[PDB]
Design an enzyme around this catalytic site. Sequence first.
Site, PDB file in Angstrom:
ATOM      1  N   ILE A  21       0.867  -1.101  -0.043  1.00  0.00           N
ATOM      2  CA  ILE A  21      -0.045   0.014   0.205  1.00  0.00           C
ATOM      3  C   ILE A  21       1.136   1.213   0.004  1.00  0.00           C
ATOM      4  O   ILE A  21       0.687   2.109  -0.797  1.00  0.00           O
ATOM      5  CB  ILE A  21      -0.951  -0.050   1.150  1.00  0.00           C
ATOM      6  CG1 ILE A  21      -2.092  -0.983   0.896  1.00  0.00           C
ATOM      7  CG2 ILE A  21      -1.648   1.392   1.508  1.00  0.00           C
ATOM      8  CD1 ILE A  21      -2.929  -1.406   2.066  1.00  0.00           C
ATOM      9  N   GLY A  22       1.762   1.441   0.946  1.00  0.00           N
ATOM     10  CA  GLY A  22       2.569   2.360   0.995  1.00  0.00           C
ATOM     11  C   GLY A  22       3.741   2.705   2.044  1.00  0.00           C
ATOM     12  O   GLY A  22       3.814   1.409   2.936  1.00  0.00           O
ATOM     13  N   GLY A  24       3.923   4.348   4.784  1.00  0.00           N
ATOM     14  CA  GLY A  24       3.398   4.799   5.995  1.00  0.00           C
ATOM     15  C   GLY A  24       3.994   6.245   6.555  1.00  0.00           C
ATOM     16  O   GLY A  24       4.651   7.066   5.848  1.00  0.00           O
ATOM     17  N   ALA A  25       3.571   6.686   7.690  1.00  0.00           N
ATOM     18  CA  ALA A  25       4.034   7.791   8.520  1.00  0.00           C
ATOM     19  C   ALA A  25       5.568   7.304   9.154  1.00  0.00           C
ATOM     20  O   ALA A  25       6.463   7.979   8.847  1.00  0.00           O
ATOM     21  CB  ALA A  25       3.235   7.845   9.852  1.00  0.00           C
ATOM     22  N   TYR A  26       5.787   6.245   9.660  1.00  0.00           N
ATOM     23  CA  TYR A  26       6.984   5.490   9.786  1.00  0.00           C
ATOM     24  C   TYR A  26       6.776   3.955  10.095  1.00  0.00           C
ATOM     25  O   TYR A  26       6.225   3.637  11.010  1.00  0.00           O
ATOM     26  CB  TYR A  26       7.706   5.959  10.859  1.00  0.00           C
ATOM     27  CG  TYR A  26       9.010   6.972  10.548  1.00  0.00           C
ATOM     28  CD1 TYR A  26      10.353   5.914  10.212  1.00  0.00           C
ATOM     29  CD2 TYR A  26       9.144   7.942  10.279  1.00  0.00           C
ATOM     30  CE1 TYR A  26      11.464   6.591   9.773  1.00  0.00           C
ATOM     31  CE2 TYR A  26      10.230   8.484  10.127  1.00  0.00           C
ATOM     32  CZ  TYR A  26      11.432   8.130   9.679  1.00  0.00           C
ATOM     33  OH  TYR A  26      12.489   8.665   9.132  1.00  0.00           O
ATOM     34  N   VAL A  29       3.076  -0.501   5.028  1.00  0.00           N
ATOM     35  CA  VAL A  29       1.862  -1.078   5.049  1.00  0.00           C
ATOM     36  C   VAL A  29       1.384  -1.857   3.973  1.00  0.00           C
ATOM     37  O   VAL A  29       1.728  -1.481   2.893  1.00  0.00           O
ATOM     38  CB  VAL A  29       0.800   0.248   5.107  1.00  0.00           C
ATOM     39  CG1 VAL A  29      -0.646  -0.221   5.242  1.00  0.00           C
ATOM     40  CG2 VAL A  29       1.291   0.998   6.547  1.00  0.00           C
ATOM     41  N   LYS A  44       0.358  -2.753   9.152  1.00  0.00           N
ATOM     42  CA  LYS A  44       1.353  -2.031   9.230  1.00  0.00           C
ATOM     43  C   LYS A  44       2.712  -2.370  10.119  1.00  0.00           C
ATOM     44  O   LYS A  44       2.472  -2.843  11.062  1.00  0.00           O
ATOM     45  CB  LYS A  44       1.253  -0.629   9.946  1.00  0.00           C
ATOM     46  CG  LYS A  44       2.218   0.384   9.892  1.00  0.00           C
ATOM     47  CD  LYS A  44       2.006   1.725  10.301  1.00  0.00           C
ATOM     48  CE  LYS A  44       3.084   2.830  10.509  1.00  0.00           C
ATOM     49  NZ  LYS A  44       2.691   3.805  11.567  1.00  0.00           N
ATOM     50  N   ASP A 139      -4.053  15.637  16.101  1.00  0.00           N
ATOM     51  CA  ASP A 139      -3.346  15.559  14.755  1.00  0.00           C
ATOM     52  C   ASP A 139      -4.633  15.124  13.725  1.00  0.00           C
ATOM     53  O   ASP A 139      -4.390  14.559  12.711  1.00  0.00           O
ATOM     54  CB  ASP A 139      -2.186  14.905  14.785  1.00  0.00           C
ATOM     55  CG  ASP A 139      -1.484  15.017  13.394  1.00  0.00           C
ATOM     56  OD1 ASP A 139      -1.649  16.098  12.761  1.00  0.00           O
ATOM     57  OD2 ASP A 139      -0.891  14.239  13.228  1.00  0.00           O
TER      58      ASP A 139
END
Length: 342
Positions: A21-22, A24-26, A29, A44, A139
């Site tokens: 998928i990607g 991520g933030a860190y 995923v 994740k 956030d």
Amino acid sequence: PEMVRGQVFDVGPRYTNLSYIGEGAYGMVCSAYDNVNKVRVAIKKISPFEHQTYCQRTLREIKILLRFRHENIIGINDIIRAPTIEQMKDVYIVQDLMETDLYKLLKTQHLSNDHICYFLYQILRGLKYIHSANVLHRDLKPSNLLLNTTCDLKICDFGLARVADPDHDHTGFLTEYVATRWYRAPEIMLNSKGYTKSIDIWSVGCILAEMLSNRPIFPGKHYLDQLNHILGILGSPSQEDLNCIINLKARNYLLSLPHKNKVPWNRLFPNADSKALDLLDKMLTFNPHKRIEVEQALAHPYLEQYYDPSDEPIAEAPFKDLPKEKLKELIFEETARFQPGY
């Protein structure tokens, strides 16, 4: 052990047929097939143990998501990790697969007023629960609002969340802050640490504005620029509102600016529902003491077709410097319930 882009992504045997998928933030995923429940899920990989800041945020996220149970808050289905602290180098968090998010949707899709109303209702219903637990998200932004193919909306990413602490909210002018800049309340730049519920309502108000136009309302490029974007639309704060700001550097900065009149919402958003703009005005109120609260927002005429306080639950169990070694042990303890046996 399965690989994805030549990095280990070892969730098996329960989770198979991985798709990236990607990044991520860190942490990476993937989606994957859950062979027990027979549905595709999101996973994740988190690798936080070398850094106390990442240990803290990971622990905070896990403890919150596990404590919370609400249809508009992402749940944790499973957590995969090694059986011992010594062998535990990664943690995998399993969630329901959410095909998109409000960030992605806004970049490509016009939203009907019915979708805007429904999405706002869902955000506030989830937020009512979070705030009832004495927790601030801190956030909220489109990419932290997940959606699935029937438009069920779930709040995620409690990495910057805090227990509310209004009595210690005060600080000086230009105090540095970590949450995403475009959704920061004006007071963060003036005199607030973001330890009150009103910080989250501002972000929701920014999101509603974004839903109306597909563009961020206050796209600041640097710390003080964000405040100046805000004032460009709201106009100069009133004397009464300035009187509330005792800090001299903050008050004097605002007094140094030329007088600026309000940009009417209905000129910024000529196709918007008038009740949507009344609620927007109340969420994007300069003075945080005058800003609408989450439960008041739910009861606003804009949401009257959904409003049902009996169907907008509160939390049963509200919440009330560790070295990374202790945080690792606490993450191990917090994830224990998912290990084979019970």
